[PDB]
Amino acid sequence: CPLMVKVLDAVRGSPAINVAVHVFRKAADDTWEPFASGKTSESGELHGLTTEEEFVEGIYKVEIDTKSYWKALGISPFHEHAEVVFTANDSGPRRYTIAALLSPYSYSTTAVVTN
Amino acid sequence: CPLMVKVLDAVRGSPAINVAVHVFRKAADDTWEPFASGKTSESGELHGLTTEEEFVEGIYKVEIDTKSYWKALGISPFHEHAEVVFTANDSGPRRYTIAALLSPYSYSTTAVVTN
Amino acid sequence: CPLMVKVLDAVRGSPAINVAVHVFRKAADDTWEPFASGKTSESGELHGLTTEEEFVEGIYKVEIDTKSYWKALGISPFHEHAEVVFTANDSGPRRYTIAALLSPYSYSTTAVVTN
Amino acid sequence: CPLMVKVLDAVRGSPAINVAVHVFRKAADDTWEPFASGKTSESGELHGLTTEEEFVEGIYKVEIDTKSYWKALGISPFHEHAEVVFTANDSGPRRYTIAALLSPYSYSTTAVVTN
Ligand SMILES: O=C(O)c1ccccc1Nc1cc(Cl)c(OCCCCCCCOc2c(Cl)cc(Nc3ccccc3C(=O)O)cc2Cl)c(Cl)c1
Numbered sequence: 001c002p003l004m005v006k007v008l009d010a011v012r013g014s015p016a017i018n019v020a021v022h023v024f025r026k027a028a029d030d031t032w033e034p035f036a037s038g039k040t041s042e043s044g045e046l047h048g049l050t051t052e053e054e055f056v057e058g059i060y061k062v063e064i065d066t067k068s069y070w071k072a073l074g075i076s077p078f079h080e081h082a083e084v085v086f087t088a089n090d091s092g093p094r095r096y097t098i099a100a101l102l103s104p105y106s107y108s109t110t111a112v113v114t115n
Numbered sequence: 116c117p118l119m120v121k122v123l124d125a126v127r128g129s130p131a132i133n134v135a136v137h138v139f140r141k142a143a144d145d146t147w148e149p150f151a152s153g154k155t156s157e158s159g160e161l162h163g164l165t166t167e168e169e170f171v172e173g174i175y176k177v178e179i180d181t182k183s184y185w186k187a188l189g190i191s192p193f194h195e196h197a198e199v200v201f202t203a204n205d206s207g208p209r210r211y212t213i214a215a216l217l218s219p220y221s222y223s224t225t226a227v228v229t230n
Numbered sequence: 231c232p233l234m235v236k237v238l239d240a241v242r243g244s245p246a247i248n249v250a251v252h253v254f255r256k257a258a259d260d261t262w263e264p265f266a267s268g269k270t271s272e273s274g275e276l277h278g279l280t281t282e283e284e285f286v287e288g289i290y291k292v293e294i295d296t297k298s299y300w301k302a303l304g305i306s307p308f309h310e311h312a313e314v315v316f317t318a319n320d321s322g323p324r325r326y327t328i329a330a331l332l333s334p335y336s337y338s339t340t341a342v343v344t345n
Numbered sequence: 346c347p348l349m350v351k352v353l354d355a356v357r358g359s360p361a362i363n364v365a366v367h368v369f370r371k372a373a374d375d376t377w378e379p380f381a382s383g384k385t386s387e388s389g390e391l392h393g394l395t396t397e398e399e400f401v402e403g404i405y406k407v408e409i410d411t412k413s414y415w416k417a418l419g420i421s422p423f424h425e426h427a428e429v430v431f432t433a434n435d436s437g438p439r440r441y442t443i444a445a446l447l448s449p450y451s452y453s454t455t456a457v458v459t460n
Pocket of ligand 1: 006008097099100101107108109110112121123212214215216223224225227236238327329330331337338339340342351353444445446452453454455
């Protein structure tokens, strides 16, 4: 799997389950084209977004729908979403894990990139 | 100052100096319209972005140009930029500080909302 | 102020007010000896912990009493406290700010070392 | 596995490999007794520290030897180690993952606690 997303909840100390994730790829006309989407599992993970064939060199945006998640838990958070924007595969094919750790007024994101 | 931005460097243990910051507001036609911008100071801070008069309720995006910062340091980074997207909500006196802590393959952002 | 502590609350998007902070220095017999302490202010800050004269090179521990903070808010937390352990090193004018960002099941700490 | 540690490197965007981890348990005399230790794998993970039988209710400290890690990469970091102190199993047996994300002058730690 070349692109995986993992989301964790810093309030509950749990995976963040059923979080919507949308991936976009920047097109030649500078617009963000829909690329893939899904929801995190019971483990906070989202796999199977793309294939090595389709995940070509480009600029990608991973939008994680954090506000919808918090609101479903009774919390009015600060952010609309977390957005992770990066160039992928520009020094050859890599496997990318995009991890996010969520709180109501903060989040962090890291990437783990491997061969 | 209803809106301040503060950027810190987790590699050097320092303010992140001379980082470009762009603020956008969501318009009517769902377009991100430029709103304010600047470069962080020697203290990693950016003040004077807007006024209480202009900073009305709405959806805002703060783009922090992290990739160019790391390139200036000779360090290969992951993200193109950090994007912080939020709704400004009245209901009383509020000042917003958007803080970001930067590493090459990670960032963190929090909002400190006070009065 | 050669040593400041700043604590922020990632759930409320606010300074973490009235948090107990204890600082220790490593002695000769490898015992943590109390050095300084206080409670964070309304701005989440704790100043006046020590003087340039007393804050010599050595190994220091800053203990931030996070569990009691979350208990005061009625929120079940994971950690007993956050502990920040570091060597203070001269070689020129240096001021240390130990920042912490708190969530119930997570914390983050950075050092901003300036002159 | 009731206790797992995962460590990631925010500079390289990689697991933090070969990081020493020491676990202590607070004894009746208020002293920290050695409990378990190991080093992170190629995946940044450390499994097999303990068993459900031996991992009883108590206050535990997980010390992650971050300074040794950074120094081996040519970096002089701020912290001596990251310390994670928590009560375990005080509302019945749980599975704990202690995750840490490391930078030279910052780290974060979260816990994922499951049934
Ligand atoms: O990644 C995996 O693969 C993974 C998989 C499974 C499990 C775990 C996995 N890892 C993993 C682990 C973790 Cl801990 C993780 O979270 C990373 C959390 C990063 C913490 C956020 C850092 C907060 O920064 C700060 C801090 Cl300290 C202070 C401040 N304030 C100030 C500091 C100084 C001066 C002024 C201020 C201010 O405010 O005016 C602002 C910020 Cl912005 C992630 Cl995203 C993935």
